[PDB]
């Protein structure tokens, strides 16, 4: 029962590829002068200390943000994100890390709004904490899969879902498919972002074979492994599948992927790839 905590994972490879196109929608939303939401089913606690025990135990981020936020040849595609990353690193020494909420709450403008739920007791606290003086948001303690039914669609009909559950659960590779497929027949112009972790990549085959049976199309699959797949314990990859996808996030990934590869990944193992689940 939620014994995950984030902050042993921050910032590595997997947040990285994650915030990077979460970033890249919220630049394409921001396009057009509507308001729209955000809605972080499995919020966390916004952000993280990467001078924590649990941080340094791992040391994951040293092979993730690490590698890419002071690179004088940063693509432009990241500099939205890396410009939020550095705003809670001001000193020059990587200290915080930014979660999907604080990303959000940075890029966002005043007309569009927030709303994030996470269940856990040390995280919801820190996480409501971060949006006390921001009115734009509202945090609640709550099951996220449940927001796929309760709040869609956004009056404003605009907006970017981003489903991040930990897989603690393996339940998790169900529901995020059930949830999808809830949350889209209330509201099926949305955009949602779905992250996965590849520690089995037959749960994974499962877990999109699944989602193709829900009939829903324009299917985009984004993933980045820094060692190629194995059934030994670790997770070698980690994805993001995207529906309904902004016409320029496939270009915007062909441009960015193969440096940030290159960065996170300095022996070149494991691979880098944009291709659809469910194409037109
Ligand atoms: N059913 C559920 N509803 C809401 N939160 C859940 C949940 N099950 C697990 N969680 C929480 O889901 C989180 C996944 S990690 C979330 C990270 C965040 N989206 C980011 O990018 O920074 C954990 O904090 C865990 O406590
Ligand atoms: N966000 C994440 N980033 C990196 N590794 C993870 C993440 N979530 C889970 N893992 C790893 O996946 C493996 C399987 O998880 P578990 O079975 O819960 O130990 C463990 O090695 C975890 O550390
Ligand atoms: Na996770």
Redesign the pocket.
């Known amino acids: 029962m939620?014994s995950?905590?984030?902050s042993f994972?921050?910032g590595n490879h997997a947040?990285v590829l994650?915030?990077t196109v979460?970033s890249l929608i919220i630049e394409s939303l921001k396009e057009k002068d509507k308001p729209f939401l955000y809605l972080?089913?499995?919020?966390?606690?916004?952000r993280?200390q990467l001078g924590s025990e649990h941080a340094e135990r791992t040391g994951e981020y040293l092979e993730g943000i690490a590698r890419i936020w002071q690179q004088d040849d940063l693509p432009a595609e990241l500099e939205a994100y890396i410009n939020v990353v550095k705003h809670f690193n001001r000193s020059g020494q990587l200290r915080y890390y930014?979660?999907?909420?604080l990303?959000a709450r940075l890029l966002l403008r005043e007309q569009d709004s927030l709303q994030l739920?996470?269940?856990?007791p040390s995280?919801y606290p820190l996480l409501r904490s971060e949006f006390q003086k921001d009115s734009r948001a509202r945090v609640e303690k709550?099951?996220?899969?449940q927001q796929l039914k309760a709040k869609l669609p956004p009056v404003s009909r605009r907006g970017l879902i981003?489903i991040?559950?930990?897989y603690?659960?393996k339940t998790?590779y169900q529901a995020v498919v059930s949830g999808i497929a809830e949350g889209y027949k209330r509201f099926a112009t949305g955009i949602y972002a779905l992250?996965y972790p590849v520690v089995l990549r037959q749960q994974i085959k499962r877990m999109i074979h699944d989602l193709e049976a829900t009939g829903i199309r324009k299917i985009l699959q984004i993933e980045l492994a820094v060692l190629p797949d194995s059934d030994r314990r670790g997770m070698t990859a980690s994805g993001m599948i995207v529906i309904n996808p902004p016409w320029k996030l496939e270009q915007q990934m062909n441009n960015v992927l193969p440096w940030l590869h290159s960065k996170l990944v300095p022996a070149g193992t494991g691979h880098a790839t944009v291709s659809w689940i469910v194409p037109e």
Not at 40 to 46: L, R, S
Not at 98 to 101: L, N, Q, R, V
């Open positions: 939620l995950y905590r984030h994972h921050a947040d994650k915030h979460q972080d089913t499995h919020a966390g606690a916004g993280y930014p979660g999907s909420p990303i739920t996470e269940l856990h995280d709550a099951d996220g899969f981003l991040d559950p930990p603690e659960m998790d992250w």
